[PDB]
Design a protein around this motif. Structure first.
Motif, mmCIF file in Angstrom:
data_model
loop_
_atom_site.group_PDB
_atom_site.id
_atom_site.type_symbol
_atom_site.label_atom_id
_atom_site.label_comp_id
_atom_site.label_asym_id
_atom_site.label_seq_id
_atom_site.Cartn_x
_atom_site.Cartn_y
_atom_site.Cartn_z
ATOM 1 N N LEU A 32 9.358 -13.199 16.385
ATOM 2 C CA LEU A 32 8.626 -12.661 15.221
ATOM 3 C C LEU A 32 9.666 -11.995 14.373
ATOM 4 N N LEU A 33 9.934 -12.589 13.227
ATOM 5 C CA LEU A 33 11.121 -12.173 12.488
ATOM 6 C C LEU A 33 11.160 -10.722 12.010
ATOM 7 N N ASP A 34 9.991 -10.275 11.607
ATOM 8 C CA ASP A 34 9.735 -8.914 11.084
ATOM 9 C C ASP A 34 8.405 -8.426 11.658
ATOM 10 N N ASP A 35 8.472 -7.555 12.655
ATOM 11 C CA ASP A 35 7.255 -7.050 13.265
ATOM 12 C C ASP A 35 6.393 -6.181 12.356
ATOM 13 N N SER A 36 6.852 -5.830 11.150
ATOM 14 C CA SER A 36 6.111 -4.900 10.291
ATOM 15 C C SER A 36 5.371 -5.612 9.137
ATOM 16 N N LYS A 37 5.385 -6.933 9.116
ATOM 17 C CA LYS A 37 5.091 -7.757 7.954
ATOM 18 C C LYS A 37 4.005 -8.824 8.197
ATOM 19 N N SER A 38 2.919 -8.742 7.467
ATOM 20 C CA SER A 38 1.822 -9.699 7.502
ATOM 21 C C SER A 38 1.737 -10.319 6.102
ATOM 22 N N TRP A 39 1.336 -11.580 6.045
ATOM 23 C CA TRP A 39 1.350 -12.346 4.832
ATOM 24 C C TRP A 39 0.001 -12.929 4.533
ATOM 25 N N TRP A 40 -0.323 -13.058 3.243
ATOM 26 C CA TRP A 40 -1.472 -13.848 2.729
ATOM 27 C C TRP A 40 -0.959 -15.020 1.922
ATOM 28 N N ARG A 41 -1.715 -16.139 2.011
ATOM 29 C CA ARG A 41 -1.447 -17.280 1.151
ATOM 30 C C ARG A 41 -2.332 -17.198 -0.085
ATOM 31 N N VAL A 42 -1.640 -17.248 -1.231
ATOM 32 C CA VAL A 42 -2.230 -17.114 -2.543
ATOM 33 C C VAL A 42 -1.832 -18.214 -3.464
ATOM 34 N N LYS B 69 0.523 -22.729 -8.520
ATOM 35 C CA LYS B 69 1.562 -22.628 -7.488
ATOM 36 C C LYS B 69 1.054 -21.790 -6.340
ATOM 37 N N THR B 70 1.257 -22.295 -5.119
ATOM 38 C CA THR B 70 0.843 -21.625 -3.935
ATOM 39 C C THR B 70 2.042 -21.081 -3.123
ATOM 40 N N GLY B 71 1.824 -19.935 -2.477
ATOM 41 C CA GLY B 71 2.772 -19.451 -1.540
ATOM 42 C C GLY B 71 2.337 -18.188 -0.836
ATOM 43 N N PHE B 72 3.207 -17.658 0.021
ATOM 44 C CA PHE B 72 2.931 -16.477 0.793
ATOM 45 C C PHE B 72 3.474 -15.205 0.141
ATOM 46 N N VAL B 73 2.660 -14.121 0.237
ATOM 47 C CA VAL B 73 3.075 -12.832 -0.247
ATOM 48 C C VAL B 73 2.709 -11.799 0.810
ATOM 49 N N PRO B 74 3.439 -10.670 0.839
ATOM 50 C CA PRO B 74 3.063 -9.667 1.846
ATOM 51 C C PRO B 74 1.657 -9.124 1.553
ATOM 52 N N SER B 75 0.847 -9.028 2.578
ATOM 53 C CA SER B 75 -0.587 -8.707 2.386
ATOM 54 C C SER B 75 -0.828 -7.356 1.709
ATOM 55 N N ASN B 76 0.075 -6.402 1.919
ATOM 56 C CA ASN B 76 -0.092 -5.099 1.334
ATOM 57 C C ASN B 76 0.340 -5.014 -0.108
ATOM 58 N N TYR B 77 0.779 -6.172 -0.659
ATOM 59 C CA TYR B 77 1.099 -6.144 -2.075
ATOM 60 C C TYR B 77 -0.076 -6.590 -2.990
ATOM 61 N N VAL B 78 -1.194 -6.979 -2.381
ATOM 62 C CA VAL B 78 -2.314 -7.491 -3.102
ATOM 63 C C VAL B 78 -3.574 -6.821 -2.562
ATOM 64 N N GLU B 79 -4.592 -6.735 -3.394
ATOM 65 C CA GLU B 79 -5.920 -6.240 -2.973
ATOM 66 C C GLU B 79 -7.057 -7.036 -3.638
#
Lengths: 59, 59
Positions: free
Chosen positions: B29-39, B45-55
């Protein structure tokens, strides 16, 4: 299921699979039931898996 | 921090950015502090962003 999210902060993508976003941008969240972790396997392939499908090794 | 995780269940990847995993496989697990959403953005254009950067826009 799919809903619209708003960027709280800018994000500069660090890899091709990530998306650059700007604060206040609105985006489609494809699946509001899925949180992903980026993992790397024994063959050195990297990719995303749903976070509930894996757990830390402490035993 | 990087840590070892263990697959709880098999997962068949649905897209090229995801990884196939098998139950009991061990992964980094490359970064244990990091969860991602696909947006998906306004330009489709689609891709992953850190989940805590969006609401969510709604609730």
């Amino acid at each position: 299921e799919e809903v619209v999210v708003v960027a709280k902060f800018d994000y500069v993508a660090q890899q091709e699979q990530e998306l650059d976003i700007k604060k206040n941008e609105r985006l489609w969240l494809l699946d509001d039931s899925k949180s992903w972790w980026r993992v790397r396997n024994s063959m050195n392939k990297t990719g995303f898996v749903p976070s509930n499908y894996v757990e830390r090794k402490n035993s």
